């Protein structure tokens, strides 16, 4: 039928492997014990997004400085849609961070855990209320490596502008591909990208609980190094007011 | 800038 790629069947190829906590269940569960957990896969999965970033066609044609704003302002938006994709996939509101650590019932009553988990099962419970297909899933989590630039703009900017494009059509030729109505495409549409432009408020929510764990020196977690300079860079930006968050529908 | 990200990027 097909001997020439198209691109969701390069998204898909390029789709980082799923990657382990390595925590340990038999010792008793902790707030504390799973905080410094996920700042540590958190930081493995970055890699993991940058090296994915790099294969994702039309990425490494944009300026190194472009290719670097970008995952330093989209990496929440990745891991929380990664998650939510996880959750949606391996089941009730149960967060999948990795095989040998799943947010269970149990673990979701522990203290703090519900008022961050929250944001994150909201992801989940949506990608499961639209049945989401796969294909539609790399669309939206590559258009979300796209959701951010600075006022200013990219270097890029035009080359940026044609990419982004490319894969909302890319999004279009999910939908239609998917089995069912073909009458509820435009909706569906509608329906996807509204939930692309939720991800921001999710962000925004996320990146403050993260930074003013960061920031708090009472606290005293760990953070993985690559990550803690991501956040240190970030950290004045998103107080001054210097990103514009790309919204689908005004 | 962070040289690993900018390392990791181009190489
Ligand atoms: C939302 C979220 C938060 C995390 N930790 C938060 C946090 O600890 C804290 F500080 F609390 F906010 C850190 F890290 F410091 F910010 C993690 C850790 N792991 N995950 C995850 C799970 C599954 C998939 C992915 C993911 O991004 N995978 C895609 C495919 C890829 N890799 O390109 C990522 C996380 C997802
Ligand atoms: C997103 C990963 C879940 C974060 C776990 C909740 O984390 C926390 O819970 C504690 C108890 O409420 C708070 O005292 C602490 O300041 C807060 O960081």
């Known amino acids: 039928p097909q001997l020439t790629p198209t691109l969701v069947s390069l998204l898909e190829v390029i789709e980082p492997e799923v990657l382990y906590a390595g925590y340990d269940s038999s010792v008793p569960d902790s707030t504390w014990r799973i905080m410094t957990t996920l700042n540590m896969l958190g930081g493995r999965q970055v890699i993991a997004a940058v090296k994915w970033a790099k294969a994702i066609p039309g990425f490494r044609n944009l300026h190194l400085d472009d290719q670097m704003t970008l995952l330093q302002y989209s990496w929440m938006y990745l891991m929380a849609f990664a998650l939510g994709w996880r959750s949606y996939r391996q089941s009730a509101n149960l967060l999948c961070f990795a095989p040998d650590l799943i947010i269970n019932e149990q673990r979701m009553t522990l203290p703090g855990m519900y008022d961050q988990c929250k944001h994150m099962l909201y992801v989940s419970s949506e990608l499961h209320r639209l049945q989401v297909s796969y294909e539609e899933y790399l669309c939206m989590k590559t258009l979300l490596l796209l959701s951010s630039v600075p006022k200013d703009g990219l270097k890029s900017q035009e080359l940026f502008d044609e990419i982004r494009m490319t894969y909302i059509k890319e999004l279009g030729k999910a939908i239609v591909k998917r089995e069912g109505n073909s009458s509820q495409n435009w909706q569906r549409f509608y329906q996807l990208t509204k939930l692309l432009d939720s991800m921001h408020e999710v962000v925004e929510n996320l990146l403050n609980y993260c930074f003013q764990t960061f920031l708090d020196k009472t606290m005293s977690i760990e953070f993985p190094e690559m990550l803690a300079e991501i956040i240190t860079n970030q950290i004045p930006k998103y107080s001054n007011g210097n990103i514009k968050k790309l919204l689908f529908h005004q | ?11």
């Not at chain 2, 990200?5 to 190489?11: A, E, G, H, I």
Request: charged share 35%.
């Open chain 2, 1 to 11: 800038e962070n040289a690993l990200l900018r390392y990791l990027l181009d190489k």
